[PDB]
């Protein structure tokens, strides 16, 4: 804020006070309890066929096809990349 109207600093020049963090923003945070529960359900429930198919695609280094196929299954790139990275961590964990 240069006491002015324009620029990538613009605004009326004041002393901003550091506002506290509100509990609504807490969403998405991991709980060791729920992280444990998700571990249990992952180990007991298993996997749907489509992630099964893509993981030996990672196993035989068929990465690009698996990424495209994961995109087709879910719909968005971020969901697809989020999927494959967690399966890969499962792959190295195994």
């Amino acid at each position: 804020a240069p006491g002015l109207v324009v620029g990538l600093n613009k605004g009326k020049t004041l002393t901003k006070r550091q506002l506290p963090e509100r509990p609504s923003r807490r969403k998405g945070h991991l709980s060791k309890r729920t992280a444990f529960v998700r571990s249990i359900v992952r180990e007991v429930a298993g996997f749907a066929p489509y992630e099964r198919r893509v993981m030996e695609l990672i196993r035989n280094s068929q990465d690009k096809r698996a990424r495209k196929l994961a995109k087709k299954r879910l719909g968005t790139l971020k969901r697809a990349k989020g999927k494959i990275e967690e399966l890969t961590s499962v792959i190295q964990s195994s």
Binding site: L4, V6, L8, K10, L14, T15, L19
Partner: protein, 180 residues
């Protein structure tokens, strides 16, 4: 279909009797609750000051009253609003402070003063809150001297080029990361 307004005097009289009946129902306490001093959110109206919904949890914490006591004694609380400029902290604070100063709380359970509510009770009076607590507009300045350093400040040196600087900041930043 065709909305006619032949009831306009009638509806106005209904509200009057609504206020008079409401006020007479709770006569000791003021008819209208207090509201904070808040600024309209846009470049057209941001200079003005108007009355908001309630005082944010920051202000009640500063004013020394809990969010429970405030609701009981007629101070509305707004949780959605958050106040960031510490003047908005301020301007609402003494607003709560002077409201508490002029506030008189009748003791519960047969008029034995509890904590610091009050001792006198004959001072029961129903007053307009905007009288004791009017909302003011922005304090404008008058008769300030010198600022010949701003004289040499030739406006567009900021406006014209910083506006261009803002416009070209993205392209400039892309340039710097490119040749790096």
């Amino acid at each position: 279909y065709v909305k006619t307004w032949f009831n306009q005097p009638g509806r106005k009289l209904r509200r009057r009797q609504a206020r008079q009946t409401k006020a007479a129902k709770i006569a000791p306490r003021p008819v209208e609750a207090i509201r904070p001093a808040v600024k309209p959110p846009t470049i057209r109206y941001n200079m003005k000051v108007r009355a908001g919904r309630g005082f944010t949890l920051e202000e009640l914490k500063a004013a020394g009253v809990s969010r429970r006591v405030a609701s009981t004694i007629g101070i509305p609380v707004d949780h959605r609003r958050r106040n960031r400029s510490e003047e908005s902290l301020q301007r609402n604070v003494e607003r709560i402070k002077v409201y508490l100063a002029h506030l008189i709380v009748f003791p519960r359970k047969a008029g034995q003063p509890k904590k610091g509510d009050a001792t006198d009770v004959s001072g029961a009076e129903q007053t307009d809150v905007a009288a004791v607590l009017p909302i003011t507009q922005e304090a404008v300045e008058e008769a300030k001297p010198i600022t010949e350093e701003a004289k040499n400040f030739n406006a567009f040196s900021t406006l014209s080029n910083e506006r261009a600087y803002a416009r070209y900041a993205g392209a400039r930043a892309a340039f710097q990361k490119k040749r790096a």
